[PDB]
């Protein structure tokens, strides 16, 4: 029961952490002249914040007290050296978003908290979509970067 | 006094110079069947000329006497071999436009010429955007040009 | 600091004084059957008052105490004998508007008051446009008045 | 070859030269408060530059190497004293543009270069119309400047 | 002048011949799955035929007797192995179209046939545009085809 309140607060932190990691990915893309991939990461940064705001709102309604935690500095950017590394980190970030949502559902299920589980259902489906989409972009980015300059042409044309 | 009037006049010449350099870039791109990159240089050539006209207009209003210098012949075209060479020269050109605007601003600041400093503000911000845009284009052109033929795709598809 | 607060209040008084001088010019023109010139002077009166109101509003937001001074009777009217005299006083009123703005900016610069400096930039630019516009009307007025009756045609046709 | 290609280049220089002379006329007119005449010179300035770009564009298509030359400092502004002097230099400039075009056409005829002659036709007709329009303006300006101040109403009303 | 009436007739044959060669080119393109290049050759085939009709129409009005000649079997299809060989034959086709226009204009000039020469003028300018466009396409095709598969995206994306 305390576990439920803890996992809920951690979901908020995880959304906001994802939102900062996305922003760090747009900066890296922008600094390295991948403006289409940057615009994509920027849109994801705003979206992750909207998720965390959606959790905060539900918690206020349900009397789950939210104690906002520190949002840590993203640190992967120190090591990114190609768009491929950035997308790989983004895939790992969404895999962790999926794990924390399942931990939260598990706790809500243990507690028979039907309302929290109903709240979570659209996030579960949305995670399935997002992991698939990022997995597919990573596969494209990886295949295209096998020919010098070719990837640059995707950024420009798509995104 | 003298240094500020001089530099204001020189700014006009620098704008027309850059207009002619963009025209010469447009010619090399056309003669070499890069119509996309040519259309872009041609638009920049008109734009630099409009910058110079804006400086002449302000000088007329502020009674800064303008004397039109000769506009020098562009020199870099005899040595351009690939689009990379052209965008590099264009980057350098814009870096000189920037330094030029800084020197004029510095002379305005010493004279406490608040009107001239205010007039220059939007040009300083525009230079930031311009140097970024050209740096970004140069990085693409340099990356795509590592595969024979791939840069033609950039011109055709996206200019 | 004292200087900047005093100068900022003096700037308000200056704009209202200019508003009354323009009103005085409009009266003289009307009484002397120059209704085109009068209507121009009258739009100028309302505009100077709007400048003084913009300074008042900024001062309220920025906690600069405003103490509204008397607005002195315009005094040039008792000696105006031709439209040339009126336009000449108006040009001098605008040159005096410009210097007070520069002095205020100078005090703002010395105090590192970046907000006040930013607030002043569009007035510096507007004064440039105004002095040029009044200098140019005064040139036309002086030149057309060399033939008896001809200036009367300017008022009717183009104001 | 040789002669034709030379003259074709020189035509582009002539257009840009005229463009700078129009611009210097605009400055003179502005500084001396003839805004109506200055707007017209400024329009011609943009128009002469478009002619030169029409020539560059055709040369690119026809494989006529363009080497862009210095655009000479306009010098007639140092001696202009009144609008008649400016319009008189402008007449002379257009008479030189015309002779310049007739020379080029003469070389094309000699070379049997039918394409170049077809390209030149609308320019010959445009020059006939421009010399006529300028002569007419100069006639009006010379006539009106017989009475002090009267020319000042041409600028204000027309233009 | 038998020479003018013969060359005029030959020009009609030449346009219809070009029409067939273009059709032959679209066939090779289509058979080798270059559908966008194919559509462009087809469009040219129709417009060569229209040029031909335009000559026949003028001739009937000017009383130049037209005797329609055999339109020969296109033969370059036997040699073509890649898109480059096709575009190269198309360039030489247009160079020979230009050349026969120039012979025609020459015979017209000799006869002082002012109406014929006036009739040919837009075709001279059109030929300049065509040779340039084809030059440019062939440069792009040759460049892109330096990487296996790359030319296939030009057909898909740009035709
Ligand atoms: Fe998302
Ligand atoms: Fe999304
Ligand atoms: Fe999320
Ligand atoms: Fe997400
Ligand atoms: Fe997404
Ligand atoms: Fe620009
Ligand atoms: Fe510029
Ligand atoms: Fe620029
Ligand atoms: Fe730009
Ligand atoms: Fe005003
Ligand atoms: Fe105003
Ligand atoms: Fe004011
Ligand atoms: Fe004012
Ligand atoms: Fe005004
Ligand atoms: Fe015109
Ligand atoms: Fe011209
Ligand atoms: Fe002209
Ligand atoms: Fe004109
Ligand atoms: Fe065609
Ligand atoms: Fe044809
Ligand atoms: Fe054709
Ligand atoms: Fe075509």
Tab-separated table of C-alpha atoms and ligand atoms in Angstrom, chain A residues 15 48 51 97 127, ligand 3:
chain	number	residue	atom	x	y	z
A	15	UNK	CA	8.498	10.415	-17.094
A	48	UNK	CA	7.064	12.592	-21.762
A	51	UNK	CA	2.674	11.824	-19.373
A	97	UNK	CA	9.575	3.361	-19.064
A	127	UNK	CA	4.305	1.649	-24.609
F	3	LIG	FE1	6.288	8.036	-20.926
